[PDB]
Amino acid sequence: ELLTMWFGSEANVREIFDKARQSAPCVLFFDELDSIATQGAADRVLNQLLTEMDGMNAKKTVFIIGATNRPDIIDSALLRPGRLDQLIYIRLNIFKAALRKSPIAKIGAL
Amino acid sequence: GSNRLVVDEAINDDNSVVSLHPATMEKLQLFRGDTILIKGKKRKDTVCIALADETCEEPKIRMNKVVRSNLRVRLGDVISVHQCPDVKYGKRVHILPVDDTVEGVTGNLFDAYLKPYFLEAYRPVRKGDLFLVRGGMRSVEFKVIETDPAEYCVVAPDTEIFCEGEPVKREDEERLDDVGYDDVGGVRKQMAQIRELVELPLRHPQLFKSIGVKPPKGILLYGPPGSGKTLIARAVANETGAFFFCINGPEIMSKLAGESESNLRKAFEEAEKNAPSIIFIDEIDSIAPKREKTNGEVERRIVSQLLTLMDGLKSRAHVIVMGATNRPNSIDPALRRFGRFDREIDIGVPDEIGRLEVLRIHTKNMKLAEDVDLERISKDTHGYVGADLAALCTEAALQCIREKMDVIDLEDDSIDAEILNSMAVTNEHFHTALGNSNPSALRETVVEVPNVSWNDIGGLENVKRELQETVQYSPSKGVLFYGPPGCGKTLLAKAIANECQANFISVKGPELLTMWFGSEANVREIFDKARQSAPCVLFFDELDSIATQGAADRVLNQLLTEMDGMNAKKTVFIIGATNRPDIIDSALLRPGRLDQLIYIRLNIFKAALRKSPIAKIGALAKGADITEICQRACKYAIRENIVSEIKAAHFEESMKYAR
Amino acid sequence: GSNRLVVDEAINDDNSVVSLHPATMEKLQLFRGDTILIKGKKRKDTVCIALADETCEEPKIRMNKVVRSNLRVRLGDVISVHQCPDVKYGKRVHILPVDDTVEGVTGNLFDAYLKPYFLEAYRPVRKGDLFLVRGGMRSVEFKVIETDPAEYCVVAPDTEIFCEGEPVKREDEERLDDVGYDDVGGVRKQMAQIRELVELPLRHPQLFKSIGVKPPKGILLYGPPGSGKTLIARAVANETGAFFFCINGPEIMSKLAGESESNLRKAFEEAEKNAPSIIFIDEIDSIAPKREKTNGEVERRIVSQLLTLMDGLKSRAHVIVMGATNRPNSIDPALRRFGRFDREIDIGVPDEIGRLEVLRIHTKNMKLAEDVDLERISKDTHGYVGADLAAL
Numbered sequence A: 001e002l003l004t005m006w007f008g009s010e011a012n013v014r015e016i017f018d019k020a021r022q023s024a025p026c027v028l029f030f031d032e033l034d035s036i037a038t039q040g041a042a043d044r045v046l047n048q049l050l051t052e053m054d055g056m057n058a059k060k061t062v063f064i065i066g067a068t069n070r071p072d073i074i075d076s077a078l079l080r081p082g083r084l085d086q087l088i089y090i091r092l093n094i095f096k097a098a099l100r101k102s103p104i105a106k107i108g109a110l
Numbered sequence B: 001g002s003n004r005l006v007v008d009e010a011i012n013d014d015n016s017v018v019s020l021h022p023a024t025m026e027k028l029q030l031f032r033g034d035t036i037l038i039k040g041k042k043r044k045d046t047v048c049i050a051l052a053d054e055t056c057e058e059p060k061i062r063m064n065k066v067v068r069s070n071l072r073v074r075l076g077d078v079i080s081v082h083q084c085p086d087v088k089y090g091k092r093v094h095i096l097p098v099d100d101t102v103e104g105v106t107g108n109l110f111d112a113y114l115k116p117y118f119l120e121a122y123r124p125v126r127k128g129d130l131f132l133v134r135g136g137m138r139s140v141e142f143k144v145i146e147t148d149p150a151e152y153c154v155v156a157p158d159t160e161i162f163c164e165g166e167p168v169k170r171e172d173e174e175r176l177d178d179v180g181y182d183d184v185g186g187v188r189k190q191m192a193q194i195r196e197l198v199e200l201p202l203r204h205p206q207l208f209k210s211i212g213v214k215p216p217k218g219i220l221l222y223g224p225p226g227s228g229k230t231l232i233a234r235a236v237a238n239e240t241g242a243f244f245f246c247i248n249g250p251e252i253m254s255k256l257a258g259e260s261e262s263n264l265r266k267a268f269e270e271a272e273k274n275a276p277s278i279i280f281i282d283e284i285d286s287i288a289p290k291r292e293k294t295n296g297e298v299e300r301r302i303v304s305q306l307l308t309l310m311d312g313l314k315s316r317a318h319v320i321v322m323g324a325t326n327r328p329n330s331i332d333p334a335l336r337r338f339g340r341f342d343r344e345i346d347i348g349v350p351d352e353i354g355r356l357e358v359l360r361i362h363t364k365n366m367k368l369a370e371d372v373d374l375e376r377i378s379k380d381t382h383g384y385v386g387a388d389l390a391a392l393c394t395e396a397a398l399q400c401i402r403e404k405m406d407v408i409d410l411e412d413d414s415i416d417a418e419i420l421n422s423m424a425v426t427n428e429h430f431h432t433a434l435g436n437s438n439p440s441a442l443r444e445t446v447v448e449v450p451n452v453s454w455n456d457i458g459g460l461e462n463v464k465r466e467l468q469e470t471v472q473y474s475p476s477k478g479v480l481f482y483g484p485p486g487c488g489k490t491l492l493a494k495a496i497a498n499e500c501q502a503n504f505i506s507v508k509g510p511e512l513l514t515m516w517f518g519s520e521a522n523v524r525e526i527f528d529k530a531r532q533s534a535p536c537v538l539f540f541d542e543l544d545s546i547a548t549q550g551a552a553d554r555v556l557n558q559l560l561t562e563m564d565g566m567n568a569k570k571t572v573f574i575i576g577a578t579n580r581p582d583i584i585d586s587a588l589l590r591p592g593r594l595d596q597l598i599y600i601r602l603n604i605f606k607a608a609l610r611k612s613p614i615a616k617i618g619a620l621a622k623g624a625d626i627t628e629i630c631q632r633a634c635k636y637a638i639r640e641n642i643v644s645e646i647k648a649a650h651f652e653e654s655m656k657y658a659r
Numbered sequence C: 001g002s003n004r005l006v007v008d009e010a011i012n013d014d015n016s017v018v019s020l021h022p023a024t025m026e027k028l029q030l031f032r033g034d035t036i037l038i039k040g041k042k043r044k045d046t047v048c049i050a051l052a053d054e055t056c057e058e059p060k061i062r063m064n065k066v067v068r069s070n071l072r073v074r075l076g077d078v079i080s081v082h083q084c085p086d087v088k089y090g091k092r093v094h095i096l097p098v099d100d101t102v103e104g105v106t107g108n109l110f111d112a113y114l115k116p117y118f119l120e121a122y123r124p125v126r127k128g129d130l131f132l133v134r135g136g137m138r139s140v141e142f143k144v145i146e147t148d149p150a151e152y153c154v155v156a157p158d159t160e161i162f163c164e165g166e167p168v169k170r171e172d173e174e175r176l177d178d179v180g181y182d183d184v185g186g187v188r189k190q191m192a193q194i195r196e197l198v199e200l201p202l203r204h205p206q207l208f209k210s211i212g213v214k215p216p217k218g219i220l221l222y223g224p225p226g227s228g229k230t231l232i233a234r235a236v237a238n239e240t241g242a243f244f245f246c247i248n249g250p251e252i253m254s255k256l257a258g259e260s261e262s263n264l265r266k267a268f269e270e271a272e273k274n275a276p277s278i279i280f281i282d283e284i285d286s287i288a289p290k291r292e293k294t295n296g297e298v299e300r301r302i303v304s305q306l307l308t309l310m311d312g313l314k315s316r317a318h319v320i321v322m323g324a325t326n327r328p329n330s331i332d333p334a335l336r337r338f339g340r341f342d343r344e345i346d347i348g349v350p351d352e353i354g355r356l357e358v359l360r361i362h363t364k365n366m367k368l369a370e371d372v373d374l375e376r377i378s379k380d381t382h383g384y385v386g387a388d389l390a391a392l
Ligand SMILES: Nc1ncnc2c1ncn2[C@@H]1O[C@H](COP(=O)(O)OP(=O)(O)O)[C@@H](O)[C@H]1O
Pocket: B183, B184, B185, B186, B187, B224, B225, B226, B227, B228, B229, B230, B231, B358, B361, B385, B386, B387, B390, C338
C-alpha cells in the first residue's frame, strides 16, 4: 500500500501519517512490513517511513504498531529507540469463541 | 557624557519603574524609591521612580515603551535625568479614557481598569500624559487631564479620582498598543543584527549624506510562512520612527500591467519622497517565482521592473527595502546581489526559551490563574510558530467565553464591563484547546539551544581538552562517536553545547533521504542553515545508511563535498554517530572530513529525575535499557483505587523477561 | 439560572416530545405525560409533553428541529418552561396544508398524512403554528389555523378535523425540511469542533466588537468528492441563522476576467454587508490549482484577487469563509496561513456506525418493512460515501 505509484515528501506515506494526526488518539497498524528488504525508489519509502516515525514521541497521544513473520530481512533501523521500543511474539491451544450459533449443531481434544 | 544617558529596553514593562546602574546612581545621589524628573526632547518631561538594577550598562537607562512615547523620544536617544525632591501627594486627579481604545467596552473604567493600576501603587503624574492599562482581553489607554498639586502629583490610596466624563481624543500620540520590540519574542538574537544595520540609515540620516560608504539598502527576510516576518519589520519601523509601506504580493498580480507597473513605481516613488523609508515586499514568492522559464509575460516584467527600480533608485536616498518570502530559494537569483538584498536574515522556529517570551506577550491582557504554569507549556510546543502560539491563545481565551456564559443574557451592544476583566482563564482552557492541537513547522531544520544537565551522563573521563575558546595564535574539526547503541551516542553531543552555549541541529540518515534531493537540496539547506548560526554543532545520527542495501549511493558523495571548506570557517564543528563501523565508506575518515574517533569504567552513576512520586542500587550492575526499566517501574503504578510509589518487589518482576 | 434551560439536540425527532433531566424535573414538580408551556423569544410559545431522560444535561433541554422553529429560537438559546395544568381536550381543529409543500401531491391529507400523525397520539395545539409530516417519499408541512378551546387544544380520537380548504401560505417560516444537524450523519465528532469555533462569531457577535482576540475566520473543509462537504456548511448556516452564499468554482472560470474579478469582489462585498456571513467556496480545487507555474493569466489573478480580499477584508467584520476541496494538497500553500484557512476539518468516509445514521435520515419519508434490517446493510457498505448512500 505504501508502494503506491503516488510516492511523489507529502506522498501517500505522509498523507497516511497526517491522516492519523488529527484523529486523537489513533493507532497506526502496519502489516506486510516484510517488504523492508531488497528483492529506482526500491529501498526508498523505508527511509521515508523512518524519518516520519520520530517526532511522534512528543505527540504522546499517538502509537505505532507493526507486524511481520520473518524478523531477519527487516532492517534493524526501526528497532532503534523512538522508532520502536518493544517486541511481542505471536499456553498450548487456547479457547476460541465461534459465532453463527443459529445454523450450528452440537472439541478441545482435536 | 556623565548625566547623558542612552535609553534602552525595559526588563519590566512598568510605566513608572525605570532601572539604572547603582554605581551611576552612587554618583548622582540616589537610591531606590526616590523619584526623578526625566526630560527627553521637545521640552516634554515626565517623572518616575528609579531602582538599583546592575543588569543595565553604566551609560544606559532602562525605559518602557509607554515611558518612551511620553517624552517624544525613541530608543537610541539621549535623555537627561534631574533629581525631583520638590514633590508631594495629590488630592484630585481627573482621568479620562482615550477615544481610540474605548471601543464597545463600558462599565466603569475606575472599578475595573484604574483601581488595579493604582491600588497600593504610588505613581507620579503629569498635567498632559497618556498611559495604557492591560486588562480584560484588551487594553484601554487613559489620559491624565488635570493635576492638583502643580504638575507633579503622586497618586495614593488618599486620592479622589473623578473618572466621570467623555472619551477624550488623541493628538499625534502613536498607539501605545502599536507593534514594538517588546511584542516580538523568540528572535531576540535575530533582532540584534537587524537592529545593528538599520539603526544608522534610519535614526542617523546625517552621515549618509557625506560618507562614500554604501549603506545597507536591501534586507531579505525569510523563515516560516506561519510567523516571524511582518512583525520583524513592523516592530522596527513603527518603533524606530520610519514610514512603513508594505506592498503585498497578491494585490500586484491582480492587475493587467496597470497597477502592476504603477504601484511598483508609485510606491517606490512614494516611499522615497519621505526620509525614513521601510518597504515591505510581502509575498515576494508570488511576485518573483525564481527563474521561471515557463510563465506569462507579466511575471517577466513585474520582476523586470523591480530590479531596475532598486539598482538605479534606492541609492543613498535613505530607503531600506525589505523582502519577505517563505523560502530564500523560490525567488530570482538576481534579487540577492549587490545593493539589492545583499543582507539576509534567518527567522527560525522559536526554541523552548523563545516560545515562553512570545507566550507572555500575547497572554498579558488576560487575567490567568496560579495553576497556569506557562513554563510547562513552553516546553512541549515544538513545531509551533508565533502564529500557532497565537492561534491557541485565541482558542484559550474564547473557550473561557462559552464556558462562563450562564446568567449573563440579552447581551447589549456595549455589554462588556467588569465581567470582561478578572476573567480567569483556567489551564483547562489551554488543555482542551490544545487537545485539538495543530502545529505547522514539522519538516523544518530546527535551530534551538540544549536544556539538558551534564550531571546525567556518568561517562569515562571525556578529556576536557576537546574544546576551545576561539583564542589561539589549523585545529581539528572532525569527530565521530561510535560504539554500542544506547551508551550515549545520541545524547552525548547534546550536553556539550550546554556549556559551549551554541545551537545544534540533529539530523538523521533517512532525513537526508528526503525526496527533495533535487545541489541546494535539503542536504545543503541543512548545511547552510547552520552556517549563519555561529557557532553551531551539526550532529548526525543514523549515519549507518552509508552503504548499499537511482540516487541510492548518492547523497553520500553529496555529503562528502560539503564537509570540506568548513575548515576555514573555524567556528563550526561536525559530529556523527554510528554503531556498525564497517559498512561506512572510509571516505569520511579522510583528513578534513573527520579527524577524530571516540568510542561509546564499569557501570557509572546515573542521575534520575521525577523525585516527587519517587520512593526510596549499584549492586544491580552485576544506557542499554536505562530508561526502559525506569518507565516500567513507573508503569508499575499500583492502581489500588478501591501512598505507594516505587518499590523493590516490582523490579524483580521486570528483569524476568528483559534482554 | 435554575429555570433557564439551554436548548439541545433531540434523540427522538418528535414534534411533541421534549426530554429533560429527572432531577431537574424533581425540582419543578413534573413527571412523564404532563404538558408544559415553553416560550422562547419574540413572545412566541408552544406546548409539549415532557419525559424523564437522564441522558441530557441538568441545565439543558432537548428540542426537535420543528419544535425549535416554532418558538423562533435556535440551538444555543435560553428558553423558559412553565407548568400548564389549565388545558383540556378539543372539539374542532382546522388543519390546512402549506403552499410550498403541496407540490403535485393530492388525494386527502387527512386519510394519508394527518391520520397516522394523530392516530392514538395526544398532542397539544397552538392557534398559529406549523409542523411537518414525513410520509410518502416526501414531506408536506401543515398549518394549524384554529383552536376550539382557547389556544391550548389537545388532539385525541375525539376530534373533528375539517381539513377541507386551500393550501395556506407561509410567512417568514423557514422550510422545516431545510438542512439541519439532524440531516448530517457519520461526522458527529467532526461537527463537534466546527460547532465549537463558529458558535461564537455567528450566534454571539457582541464580544468580537470589543475583544482584541482574533477569532476564527478561515475554515477549510476537505474530504471526499463524493459527499460530506456542502451539508457540513449548509446544515450550519441554515440552522445557526447565518447568511449563506456558496460561490461555485466552475462558474467563476466561465468568464473573461469580467465576473471573475467582479463576483469575487461583489460576493465578498455582499456577504460583509450582512452581519452573519458564511461564504462557501465550492470547487476551490478549480480556482486554486496549487502552485501552478504552467497555466494562464486568469488563474494567476483569480487566486491573486482572493488572498488580498481575505487578509485585508475578513478581519473582525463577522465573516467566516469556508473553502471546499477534494484534497487539501491541490490548492495554493498561501491559502492556509494566518487568518486565511488556518482552520482545517477532516471529512472521512463514514464508519459502520456513521453509515447507519445517514441511512436513517434519508430513509424517513419512506414506509419500510420489518424484514428490512438497515443495520445489516450498514455493515457491508465500506467505500460508500453519503452520496452513494443516497444514490442507492
Ligand atoms: N517572533 C514573534 N514574536 C511575537 N509574536 C509573533 C512572532 N511571530 C508572529 N507573531 C504573531 O503571529 C501573528 C501572525 O504572524 P505574522 O507575523 O503575520 O506571520 P508572517 O509575518 O510570517 O506572515 C502576528 O500578529 C504576531 O502577533
